[PDB]
Design a protein around this ligand. Sequence first.
Ligand SMILES: *[C@@H]1O[C@H](CO[C@@H]2O[C@@H](C)[C@@H](O)[C@@H](O)[C@@H]2O)[C@@H](O[C@@H]2O[C@H](CO)[C@@H](O[C@@H]3O[C@H](CO[C@H]4O[C@H](CO[C@H]5O[C@H](CO)[C@@H](O)[C@H](O)[C@@H]5O)[C@@H](O)[C@H](O)[C@@H]4O)[C@@H](O)[C@H](O[C@H]4O[C@H](CO)[C@@H](O)[C@H](O)[C@@H]4O[C@@H]4O[C@H](CO)[C@@H](O)[C@H](O)[C@H]4NC(C)=O)[C@@H]3O)[C@H](O)[C@H]2NC(C)=O)[C@H](O)[C@H]1NC(C)=O
Ligand SMILES: *[C@@H]1O[C@H](CO)[C@@H](O[C@@H]2O[C@H](CO)[C@@H](O[C@@H]3O[C@H](CO[C@H]4O[C@H](CO[C@H]5O[C@H](CO)[C@@H](O)[C@H](O)[C@@H]5O)[C@@H](O)[C@H](O)[C@@H]4O)[C@@H](O)[C@H](O[C@H]4O[C@H](CO)[C@@H](O)[C@H](O[C@H]5O[C@H](CO)[C@@H](O)[C@H](O)[C@@H]5O)[C@@H]4O)[C@@H]3O)[C@H](O)[C@H]2NC(C)=O)[C@H](O)[C@H]1NC(C)=O
Ligand SMILES: *[C@@H]1O[C@H](CO)[C@@H](O[C@@H]2O[C@H](CO)[C@@H](O[C@@H]3O[C@H](CO[C@H]4O[C@H](CO[C@H]5O[C@H](CO)[C@@H](O)[C@H](O)[C@@H]5O)[C@@H](O)[C@H](O[C@H]5O[C@H](CO)[C@@H](O)[C@H](O)[C@@H]5O)[C@@H]4O)[C@@H](O)[C@H](O[C@H]4O[C@H](CO)[C@@H](O)[C@H](O)[C@@H]4O)[C@@H]3O)[C@H](O)[C@H]2NC(C)=O)[C@H](O)[C@H]1NC(C)=O
Ligand SMILES: *[C@@H]1O[C@H](CO)[C@@H](O[C@@H]2O[C@H](CO)[C@@H](O[C@@H]3O[C@H](CO[C@H]4O[C@H](CO[C@H]5O[C@H](CO)[C@@H](O)[C@H](O)[C@@H]5O)[C@@H](O)[C@H](O)[C@@H]4O)[C@@H](O)[C@H](O[C@H]4O[C@H](CO)[C@@H](O)[C@H](O)[C@@H]4O)[C@@H]3O)[C@H](O)[C@H]2NC(C)=O)[C@H](O)[C@H]1NC(C)=O
Ligand SMILES: *[C@@H]1O[C@H](CO[C@@H]2O[C@@H](C)[C@@H](O)[C@@H](O)[C@@H]2O)[C@@H](O[C@@H]2O[C@H](CO)[C@@H](O[C@@H]3O[C@H](CO[C@H]4O[C@H](CO)[C@@H](O)[C@H](O)[C@@H]4O)[C@@H](O)[C@H](O)[C@@H]3O)[C@H](O)[C@H]2NC(C)=O)[C@H](O)[C@H]1NC(C)=O
Ligand SMILES: *[C@@H]1O[C@H](CO)[C@@H](O[C@@H]2O[C@H](CO)[C@@H](O[C@@H]3O[C@H](CO)[C@@H](O)[C@H](O)[C@@H]3O)[C@H](O)[C@H]2NC(C)=O)[C@H](O)[C@H]1NC(C)=O
Ligand SMILES: *[C@@H]1O[C@H](CO)[C@@H](O[C@@H]2O[C@H](CO)[C@@H](O[C@@H]3O[C@H](CO)[C@@H](O)[C@H](O)[C@@H]3O)[C@H](O)[C@H]2NC(C)=O)[C@H](O)[C@H]1NC(C)=O
Ligand SMILES: *[C@@H]1O[C@H](CO)[C@@H](O[C@@H]2O[C@H](CO)[C@@H](O[C@@H]3O[C@H](CO)[C@@H](O)[C@H](O)[C@@H]3O)[C@H](O)[C@H]2NC(C)=O)[C@H](O)[C@H]1NC(C)=O
Ligand SMILES: *[C@@H]1O[C@H](CO)[C@@H](O[C@@H]2O[C@H](CO)[C@@H](O[C@@H]3O[C@H](CO)[C@@H](O)[C@H](O)[C@@H]3O)[C@H](O)[C@H]2NC(C)=O)[C@H](O)[C@H]1NC(C)=O
Ligand SMILES: *[C@@H]1O[C@H](CO)[C@@H](O[C@@H]2O[C@H](CO)[C@@H](O)[C@H](O)[C@H]2NC(C)=O)[C@H](O)[C@H]1NC(C)=O
Ligand SMILES: *[C@@H]1O[C@H](CO)[C@@H](O)[C@H](O)[C@H]1NC(C)=O
Ligand SMILES: *[C@@H]1O[C@H](CO)[C@@H](O)[C@H](O)[C@H]1NC(C)=O
Ligand SMILES: *[C@@H]1O[C@H](CO)[C@@H](O)[C@H](O)[C@H]1NC(C)=O
Lengths: 452, 41, 134
Amino acid sequence: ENLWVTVYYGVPVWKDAETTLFCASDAKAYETEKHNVWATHACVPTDPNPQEIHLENVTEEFNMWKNNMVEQMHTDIISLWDQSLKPCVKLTPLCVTLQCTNVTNNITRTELKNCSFNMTTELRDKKQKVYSLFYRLDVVQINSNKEYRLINCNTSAITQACPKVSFEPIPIHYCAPAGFAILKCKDKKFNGTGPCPSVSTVQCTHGIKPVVSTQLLLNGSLAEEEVMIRSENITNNAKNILVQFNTPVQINCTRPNNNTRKSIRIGPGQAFYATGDIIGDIRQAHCNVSKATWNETLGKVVKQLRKHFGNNTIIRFANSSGGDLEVTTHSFNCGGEFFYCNTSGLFNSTWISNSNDSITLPCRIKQIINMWQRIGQAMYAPPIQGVIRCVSNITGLILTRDGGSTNSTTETFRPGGGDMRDNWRSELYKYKVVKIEPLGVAPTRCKRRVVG
Amino acid sequence: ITRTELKNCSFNMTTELRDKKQKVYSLFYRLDVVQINSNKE
Amino acid sequence: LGFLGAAGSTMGAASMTLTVQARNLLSGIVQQQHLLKLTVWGIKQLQARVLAVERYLRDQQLLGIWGCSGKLICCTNVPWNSSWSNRNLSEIWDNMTWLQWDKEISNYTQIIYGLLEESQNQQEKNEQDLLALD
Ligand SMILES: *[C@@H]1O[C@H](CO[C@@H]2O[C@@H](C)[C@@H](O)[C@@H](O)[C@@H]2O)[C@@H](O[C@@H]2O[C@H](CO)[C@@H](O[C@@H]3O[C@H](CO[C@H]4O[C@H](CO[C@H]5O[C@H](CO)[C@@H](O)[C@H](O)[C@@H]5O)[C@@H](O)[C@H](O)[C@@H]4O)[C@@H](O)[C@H](O[C@H]4O[C@H](CO)[C@@H](O)[C@H](O)[C@@H]4O[C@@H]4O[C@H](CO)[C@@H](O)[C@H](O)[C@H]4NC(C)=O)[C@@H]3O)[C@H](O)[C@H]2NC(C)=O)[C@H](O)[C@H]1NC(C)=O
Ligand SMILES: *[C@@H]1O[C@H](CO)[C@@H](O[C@@H]2O[C@H](CO)[C@@H](O[C@@H]3O[C@H](CO[C@H]4O[C@H](CO[C@H]5O[C@H](CO)[C@@H](O)[C@H](O)[C@@H]5O)[C@@H](O)[C@H](O)[C@@H]4O)[C@@H](O)[C@H](O[C@H]4O[C@H](CO)[C@@H](O)[C@H](O[C@H]5O[C@H](CO)[C@@H](O)[C@H](O)[C@@H]5O)[C@@H]4O)[C@@H]3O)[C@H](O)[C@H]2NC(C)=O)[C@H](O)[C@H]1NC(C)=O
Ligand SMILES: *[C@@H]1O[C@H](CO)[C@@H](O[C@@H]2O[C@H](CO)[C@@H](O[C@@H]3O[C@H](CO[C@H]4O[C@H](CO[C@H]5O[C@H](CO)[C@@H](O)[C@H](O)[C@@H]5O)[C@@H](O)[C@H](O[C@H]5O[C@H](CO)[C@@H](O)[C@H](O)[C@@H]5O)[C@@H]4O)[C@@H](O)[C@H](O[C@H]4O[C@H](CO)[C@@H](O)[C@H](O)[C@@H]4O)[C@@H]3O)[C@H](O)[C@H]2NC(C)=O)[C@H](O)[C@H]1NC(C)=O
Ligand SMILES: *[C@@H]1O[C@H](CO)[C@@H](O[C@@H]2O[C@H](CO)[C@@H](O[C@@H]3O[C@H](CO[C@H]4O[C@H](CO[C@H]5O[C@H](CO)[C@@H](O)[C@H](O)[C@@H]5O)[C@@H](O)[C@H](O)[C@@H]4O)[C@@H](O)[C@H](O[C@H]4O[C@H](CO)[C@@H](O)[C@H](O)[C@@H]4O)[C@@H]3O)[C@H](O)[C@H]2NC(C)=O)[C@H](O)[C@H]1NC(C)=O
Ligand SMILES: *[C@@H]1O[C@H](CO[C@@H]2O[C@@H](C)[C@@H](O)[C@@H](O)[C@@H]2O)[C@@H](O[C@@H]2O[C@H](CO)[C@@H](O[C@@H]3O[C@H](CO[C@H]4O[C@H](CO)[C@@H](O)[C@H](O)[C@@H]4O)[C@@H](O)[C@H](O)[C@@H]3O)[C@H](O)[C@H]2NC(C)=O)[C@H](O)[C@H]1NC(C)=O
Ligand SMILES: *[C@@H]1O[C@H](CO)[C@@H](O[C@@H]2O[C@H](CO)[C@@H](O[C@@H]3O[C@H](CO)[C@@H](O)[C@H](O)[C@@H]3O)[C@H](O)[C@H]2NC(C)=O)[C@H](O)[C@H]1NC(C)=O
Ligand SMILES: *[C@@H]1O[C@H](CO)[C@@H](O[C@@H]2O[C@H](CO)[C@@H](O[C@@H]3O[C@H](CO)[C@@H](O)[C@H](O)[C@@H]3O)[C@H](O)[C@H]2NC(C)=O)[C@H](O)[C@H]1NC(C)=O
Ligand SMILES: *[C@@H]1O[C@H](CO)[C@@H](O[C@@H]2O[C@H](CO)[C@@H](O[C@@H]3O[C@H](CO)[C@@H](O)[C@H](O)[C@@H]3O)[C@H](O)[C@H]2NC(C)=O)[C@H](O)[C@H]1NC(C)=O
Ligand SMILES: *[C@@H]1O[C@H](CO)[C@@H](O[C@@H]2O[C@H](CO)[C@@H](O[C@@H]3O[C@H](CO)[C@@H](O)[C@H](O)[C@@H]3O)[C@H](O)[C@H]2NC(C)=O)[C@H](O)[C@H]1NC(C)=O
Ligand SMILES: *[C@@H]1O[C@H](CO)[C@@H](O[C@@H]2O[C@H](CO)[C@@H](O)[C@H](O)[C@H]2NC(C)=O)[C@H](O)[C@H]1NC(C)=O
Ligand SMILES: *[C@@H]1O[C@H](CO)[C@@H](O)[C@H](O)[C@H]1NC(C)=O
Ligand SMILES: *[C@@H]1O[C@H](CO)[C@@H](O)[C@H](O)[C@H]1NC(C)=O
Ligand SMILES: *[C@@H]1O[C@H](CO)[C@@H](O)[C@H](O)[C@H]1NC(C)=O
């Protein structure tokens, strides 16, 4: 006996918890381009020196499908999207009886309409007719001379996005507040979520960019080894599966249409930017994929799924069965306009048990959108005048169920990205924040002065 | 054909298209409405 | 050892450099750094800076009523109760991380705090009644 208790301020202990974070991005575009939708007009700049410390002898258990960093990311981008659209031109007097006719094809695919209507002019007393153009599926028939209707006027409002807003995703660091720390896993093969042995305590995450993609993730991060397979629950086929590419496949998307900005003043100052007549031929949008480079990626995936999924059953790769055309096609915002390249061409290959040609995909463009199934308010995308090219790295895949097969064999995973939060999980699978507790009591024979 | 307190009223409003208008008959309560100046308007 | 360097090391080695851990936490995060400033990031910055000081000051208020206003390590005149842990002198300090110890007293950690205020300060600062001037 005769042991006393002693206090220690500065002890390294923590408990699993989550709180608010903040943005961090250095000097990116500022003057040459500004008014970004993600970095806002000003965010807390990150320091070039990276805050990193390697932790030894520690094996903290992470979690990815129960991590709340993706939850705050999901909800931050949503409130950020609306904050950058509230001060922009509303498009309410654009819901008037549209009388359209098919475009000039030498009296003979269609996909677009040379439509018109009459709107408000600078004077509310006077009205003005202007002929613009619209895309298919942005409009659906009402009930000779075709008379059409904006599809959104049936369900929700509409507000045009601002023309000087940059929709390019830039790296947005999520750094921890004071008294907290973001633990990153350094173990390469982090199957599922368990006890990651190689941990690093970093203050600022890496360059995370908010790629708004569907079925196929682009510009993601990865750190070697077999193409990693992550699933909240491997036995349940109903759950979604995130897949990471040991090497990215360089893809290029573009639209050949040469459009023109037609500004028409609605009301006092606001102007509605629509499509004029398309100059220099009309062509369909497409995304190329390296055919030889894709056959190796589908082979590496099926190899590591094999020891994961019995390694005895048959591979059945099909198009995204069911769903909606925006949730089953590779939907993504690129170059201002919103592409929806046809996925069904990639997963036609089936491989089981033991200058150069490139596969391409037909794509269409949509101007009316309200992503992540937000039915509150929709937005019109002004057609970007001139040329468009995307040319991004693809690094991830989103695959979903394969029916309720009762035992037997034969199954895979067809593409579905029904949830937008999973897209951010491909970057935050290794991060978890903890509540640092600097207080720690321990006994030791040790006492201060007797009387004082 | 014979207390009253309520009115089977109508009007025409805006529809989904600002070009078109639509008439709908609704109801209202007394004191929520007071006369303007046959057929009551 | 730049920060949490001894998170996995022994409680003794972690006790050799616990200054570092204390320095970075209050200061850390580089908080210091269209015309509006009402954005979603600024409001997440301000409240993240409020708990920064309100979790620091939540802890610094405890050391002040323990005689440890400006000391990282006080030896306190409170006797250790055997029920809290049965392990000997070199049994815990040469074997457990601070992580393991935090869960081993987390049950009766509040019982310690209440007793620390009584003997080290509630009685000690009173014991000078007969000794201050006499
Ligand atoms: C997508 O849709 C848009 C919208 O088109 C819409 O429907 C058409 C029918 C038209 O009414 C549009 O106003 C409307 O918004 C398309 O954009 C339009 O495409 C049409 C295609 O025909 C273009 O029409 C031609 O316009 C020529 C010039 O007229 C302009 O100026 C007029 C007033 O100017 C006067 O003085 C100038 C000289 O300073 C004269 O050149 C002009 O004729 C007038 O005397 C104005 O009223 C017009 O709206 C327009 O702004 C016009 O010369 C053409 O008409 C000729 O030739 C045609 C073949 O090229 C032929 O088919 C016509 O029948 C016509 O022949 C006769 O010409 C006489 C000349 O005096 C005339 O008096 C006769 O009446 C006429 N015969 C009869 C009867 O018809 C065309 O009318 C139009 O300019 C485009 N928009 C504009 C700028 O207004 C767009 O092309 C579509 N997509 C694509 C890519 O196809
Ligand atoms: C995943 O990652 C990938 C990474 O590749 C992302 O993909 C793309 O990555 C590209 C990397 O280069 C990005 O390319 C940039 O494109 C912009 C386009 O801006 C043009 O148009 C703006 C507005 O239009 C005005 O001007 C045009 C004429 O161009 C006119 O027709 C219109 O009417 C209107 O007036 C202009 O403000 C802008 O200036 C430009 O014209 C481009 O600005 C970037 O510029 C760099 O590269 C170009 C071409 O080599 C070069 O000329 C630039 O040089 C300097 O001078 C120019 C001219 O004064 C000046 O604008 C620059 O600021 C420079 O000072 C500069 O080096 C660049 O080409 C692309 O945006 C990005 N996104 C797309 C579309 O995919 C991908 O996005 C990521 N993930 C996904 C899918 O989102
Ligand atoms: C994204 O892009 C993908 C691209 O695939 C697209 O998928 C399309 O989905 C639609 C609807 O689900 C398909 O639509 C129809 O398919 C019909 C099926 O073929 C019948 O007729 C056959 C003769 O067709 C020849 O070509 C087919 C390929 O389509 C080929 O298999 C045949 O061998 C043959 O060469 C007939 O053979 C076939 O069934 C017999 O043969 C098969 C194969 O040997 C055998 O297994 C069976 O047992 C049976 O013996 C079947 O009866 C097709 O007929 C139809 O229209 C065709 O003719 C019209 C008129 O000329 C053409 O205009 C049209 O181009 C077709 O040639 C129509 O195509 C479609 O096939 C899928 N793919 C495409 C585009 O071909 C997705 O929907 C896209 N996503 C979005 C967002 O839309
Ligand atoms: C990822 O998540 C999935 C979620 O599904 C986890 O998947 C587990 O899969 C196994 C596959 O066998 C399931 O096993 C069975 O689930 C049954 C579901 O119960 C349903 O029916 C109940 C009763 O309804 C009527 O039909 C049943 C049919 O058996 C009759 O027995 C009964 O008399 C009725 O006529 C409903 O009450 C219930 O709501 C469902 O609709 C279970 O019923 C079944 O129980 C058997 O086995 C039990 C455990 O040994 C045993 O105690 C029972 O007596 C009985 O023998 C059995 O559990 C899992 O249920 C399923 N999990 C969940 C959450 O349901 C998957 O494990 C996870 N990831 C992992 C770890 O891989
Ligand atoms: C820290 O303390 C907690 C809770 O203890 C409370 O707090 C402390 C400060 C004291 O004030 C205690 O008096 C308080 O009660 C401990 O939590 C225990 O966790 C375990 C595991 O989860 C609990 O075990 C349960 O066992 C149930 C089955 O009971 C079986 O045995 C009974 C008795 O014979 C029998 O009747 C029954 O039929 C079963 O055979 C089981 O159903 C349940 O799921 C659970 O496993 C235990 O009950 C908790 N404590 C108490 C006493 O409630 C921590 O373990 C402790 N940690 C440390 C490090 O000390
Ligand atoms: C806004 O555009 C609409 C059409 O979407 C205008 O409504 C009427 O549209 C018809 C379409 O043919 C116009 O045609 C004209 O019809 C008359 C009589 O049948 C005919 O003599 C003319 O030669 C021509 O074919 C018509 O002008 C137009 N208005 C009327 C009175 O019917 C609408 O007028 C436009 N602007 C608004 C809202 O006032
Ligand atoms: C990552 O790999 C680890 C193994 O290193 C997996 O842990 C083990 O996973 C299997 C299958 O999921 C578990 O077996 C099953 O457990 C469930 C209950 O969760 C039970 O219902 C089944 O009958 C079966 O027993 C196993 O218990 C689990 N743990 C251990 C210690 O083996 C892990 O699932 C993989 N996935 C991750 C976390 O990414
Ligand atoms: C997309 O469409 C625009 C507009 O048509 C194209 O811009 C045009 O490019 C040509 C290339 O030679 C320019 O050169 C010449 O202009 C003279 C005078 O106007 C004209 O007589 C010649 O026939 C020739 O067009 C032209 O000035 C320029 N702009 C216009 C007003 O047509 C553009 O080239 C197309 N796509 C791209 C980006 O290449
Ligand atoms: C919205 O409702 C108003 C009424 O509050 C419409 O104004 C006119 O209301 C009268 C009420 O009797 C309608 O009666 C019609 O009168 C004509 C001619 O006197 C008669 O031949 C018919 O048998 C019938 O009794 C009339 O249709 C209606 N419009 C006109 C042109 O007078 C108003 O038209 C409605 N919608 C709007 C704002 O356009
Ligand atoms: C697919 O399965 C075969 C056999 O079912 C694997 O070959 C090895 O088989 C033995 C005995 O069944 C196992 O103990 C080994 O673990 C198997 N190899 C490994 C490394 O898993 C074959 O390897 C499996 N597919 C692949 C290519 O991994
Ligand atoms: C225009 O395209 C629509 C698409 O449904 C079609 O119904 C209509 O018949 C076409 N009209 C002409 C004449 O091409
Ligand atoms: C994309 O464009 C680049 C331009 O050099 C080209 O080298 C590459 O092969 C293209 N990839 C595909 C398949 O689209
Ligand atoms: C070691 O622990 C026992 C109780 O298990 C205790 O009686 C003994 O006093 C401790 N050793 C020392 C150094 O006092």
